[PDB]
Design an enzyme around this catalytic site. Structure first.
Site, mmCIF file in Angstrom:
data_model
loop_
_atom_site.group_PDB
_atom_site.id
_atom_site.type_symbol
_atom_site.label_atom_id
_atom_site.label_comp_id
_atom_site.label_asym_id
_atom_site.label_seq_id
_atom_site.Cartn_x
_atom_site.Cartn_y
_atom_site.Cartn_z
ATOM 1 N N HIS A 118 -8.400 -10.050 22.530
ATOM 2 C CA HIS A 118 -8.894 -11.355 22.114
ATOM 3 C C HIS A 118 -7.892 -12.176 21.330
ATOM 4 O O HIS A 118 -8.124 -13.357 21.073
ATOM 5 C CB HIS A 118 -10.199 -11.226 21.321
ATOM 6 N N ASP B 212 -10.576 -3.640 23.940
ATOM 7 C CA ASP B 212 -9.932 -4.727 23.227
ATOM 8 C C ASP B 212 -8.515 -4.317 22.812
ATOM 9 O O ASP B 212 -8.265 -3.941 21.668
ATOM 10 C CB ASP B 212 -10.765 -5.113 22.001
ATOM 11 N N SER C 105 -6.910 -9.013 13.061
ATOM 12 C CA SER C 105 -7.045 -8.530 14.438
ATOM 13 C C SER C 105 -5.725 -8.183 15.097
ATOM 14 O O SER C 105 -4.698 -8.831 14.853
ATOM 15 C CB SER C 105 -7.769 -9.555 15.314
ATOM 16 N N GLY C 106 -5.770 -7.159 15.947
ATOM 17 C CA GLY C 106 -4.584 -6.716 16.660
ATOM 18 C C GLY C 106 -3.696 -5.847 15.793
ATOM 19 O O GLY C 106 -2.836 -5.134 16.299
ATOM 20 N N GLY D 44 -7.901 -12.628 10.756
ATOM 21 C CA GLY D 44 -6.460 -12.680 10.653
ATOM 22 C C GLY D 44 -5.834 -11.297 10.763
ATOM 23 O O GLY D 44 -4.623 -11.172 10.949
ATOM 24 N N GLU E 30 8.493 -8.727 8.794
ATOM 25 C CA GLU E 30 7.905 -9.761 7.942
ATOM 26 C C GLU E 30 7.146 -9.207 6.742
ATOM 27 O O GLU E 30 6.766 -8.035 6.703
ATOM 28 C CB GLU E 30 6.963 -10.647 8.766
ATOM 29 N N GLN F 268 8.202 -17.577 3.521
ATOM 30 C CA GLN F 268 9.588 -17.518 3.064
ATOM 31 C C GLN F 268 10.403 -16.504 3.852
ATOM 32 O O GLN F 268 9.948 -15.377 4.070
ATOM 33 C CB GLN F 268 9.645 -17.163 1.583
#
Lengths: 240, 7
Positions: A45, A93, A188-189, A186, A59, A64
């Site tokens: 999704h 999913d 998800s995955g 935020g 990250e 920044q």
């Protein structure tokens, strides 16, 4: 991630930020797990949509450039064939994303270790969910990568009437549900890191929560069970 | 259920 803490910079080097191009810049929409210098595992999704996707490895702070990040685009999206964009509770999913260029592996960018095919964690196994999702249910997105202790809730319990009942399938993993900690919009995955005999491994891909909110008692965050898709994953990488 | 992505 609700009820968590800012993770120690790059302590989850396989965690990646799935971002789509919005206007002139990029926006974070999902998390993911780097599994090959050129392959990222995430939720279906997160990528049904026809968007221009970019992936960020190494990250930590989304606002920044600390110099440890690498920005690569998504060349091809492979959603699991059985995925139903209208029924997340149906399962399947998961999606793989071949990258434009291969990321340079280092101490900030590492591949995530996947469990052995079919591995099932014993109830209440120690795991941590990581992500840039909301930190307060119905609040704001996280600037810095968050993490939270999210032990597993075995199928027996998770599928019980008081929990998720029939909503959860055997191909999923439940973690948390203590009302204080959970994933949130935020995340998800993203991955669910579980410690098993000293070794950490991404056992789940963040999928969903209850309509009632993120940290809702007896409604643990639900992830796709990675150990249930190993064969599919290998096939997708091999033939692409 | 509601996905953690806002789907």
């Amino acid at each position: 991630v609700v009820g968590g803490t800012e993770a120690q910079r790059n302590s989850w080097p396989s965690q990646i930020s799935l971002q789509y191009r919005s206007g002139s810049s990029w926006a974070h929409t999902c998390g993911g797990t780097l599994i090959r210098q050129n392959w990222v595992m995430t939720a279906a999704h997160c990528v049904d949509r026809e968007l221009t996707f970019r992936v960020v490895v190494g990250e930590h702070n989304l606002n920044q450039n600390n110099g440890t990040e690498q920005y690569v685009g998504v060349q091809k999206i492979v959603v699991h064939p059985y995925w139903n964009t209208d029924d997340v509770a149906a399962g399947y999913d998961i999606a793989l994303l071949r990258l434009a260029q291969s990321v340079t592996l280092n101490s900030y960018v590492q591949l995530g270790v996947l469990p052995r095919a079919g591995t099932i964690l014993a109830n209440n196994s120690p795991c941590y969910i990581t992500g840039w999702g909301l930190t307060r249910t119905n609040g704001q997105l996280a600037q810095t990568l968050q993490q939270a202790y999210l032990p597993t809730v075995d199928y027996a319990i998770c599928s019980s009437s008081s929990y998720w009942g029939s909503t959860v399938k055997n191909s999923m993993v439940c973690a948390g549900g203590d009302g204080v900690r959970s994933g949130c919009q935020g995340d998800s995955g993203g991955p669910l890191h579980c410690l098993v005999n000293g070794q950490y491994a991404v056992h789940g891909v963040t999928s969903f929560v209850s309509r009632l909110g993120c940290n809702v008692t007896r409604k643990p965050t639900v992830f796709t069970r990675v150990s249930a898709y190993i064969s599919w994953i290998n096939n997708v990488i091999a033939s692409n | 259920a509601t996905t953690l992505x806002x789907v």
